[PDB]
Amino acid sequence: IEVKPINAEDTYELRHRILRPNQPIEACMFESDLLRGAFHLGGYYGGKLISIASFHQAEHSELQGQKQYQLRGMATLEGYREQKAGSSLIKHAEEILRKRGADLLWCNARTSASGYYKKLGFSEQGEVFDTPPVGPHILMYKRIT
Numbered sequence: 001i002e003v004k005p006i007n008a009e010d011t012y013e014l015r016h017r018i019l020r021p022n023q024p025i026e027a028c029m030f031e032s033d034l035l036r037g038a039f040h041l042g043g044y045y046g047g048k049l050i051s052i053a054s055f056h057q058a059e060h061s062e063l064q065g066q067k068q069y070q071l072r073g074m075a076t077l078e079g080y081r082e083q084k085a086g087s088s089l090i091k092h093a094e095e096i097l098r099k100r101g102a103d104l105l106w107c108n109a110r111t112s113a114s115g116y117y118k119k120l121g122f123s124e125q126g127e128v129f130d131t132p133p134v135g136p137h138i139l140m141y142k143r144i145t
């Protein structure tokens with residue numbers, strides 16, 4: 001897997017295909033892409049973008065740490081999962097975040113992906129909640145100090 005910077009617009013196709021296929025493409029144009037300091041990473045394999053992840057500064061009222069970042073749009077294409085594409089994006093992002101002085105990385109994780117974030121050292125906080133129309137989510141976080 002090769003991890004490279006990508007632009008926000010480069011994420012829409014895979015966000016749409018993997019995360020939100022039953023909504024218009026506009027549902028994948030996350031407003032948070034337009035928040036200060038947002039950045040995006042792609043994982044490439046055999047000449048194809050196959051994994052994506054997006055990060056921006058956002059301090060969650062319920063997590064402790066002066067500077068926090070949120071992960072959105074975490075997805076790897078079927079056929080290319082279980083290759084450490086996702087893990088590679090997260091580790092690369094952790095370097096960028098640590099260099100920026102961020103204290104923690106959090107996600108409103110799909111409960112179906114909770115084991116993935118667990119393997120990457122995230123913890124669950126609070127209770128499972130629903131996010132229309134994309135189902136059960138749970139707050140998860142990793143302290144990176």
Ligand SMILES: CC(C)(COP(=O)(O)OP(=O)(O)OC[C@H]1O[C@@H](n2cnc3c(N)ncnc32)[C@H](O)[C@@H]1OP(=O)(O)O)[C@@H](O)C(=O)NCCC(=O)NCCSO
Nearest residue numbers: 074075076081082083084085086087109110112113115116
């Ligand atoms: C969740 C994921 C992004 C994972 O991507 P990946 O590239 O396959 O991850 P990876 O780095 O190869 O996997 C890392 C580890 O977690 C495990 N893992 C991956 N997906 C998992 C899941 N859904 N549940 C539990 N464990 C998982 C892998 O088996 C691997 O474990 P080992 O090291 O023990 O073999 C991908 O399966 C996916 O896109 N799923 C559908 C969309 C989704 O749910 N995205 C997350 C939304 S959170 O807001």
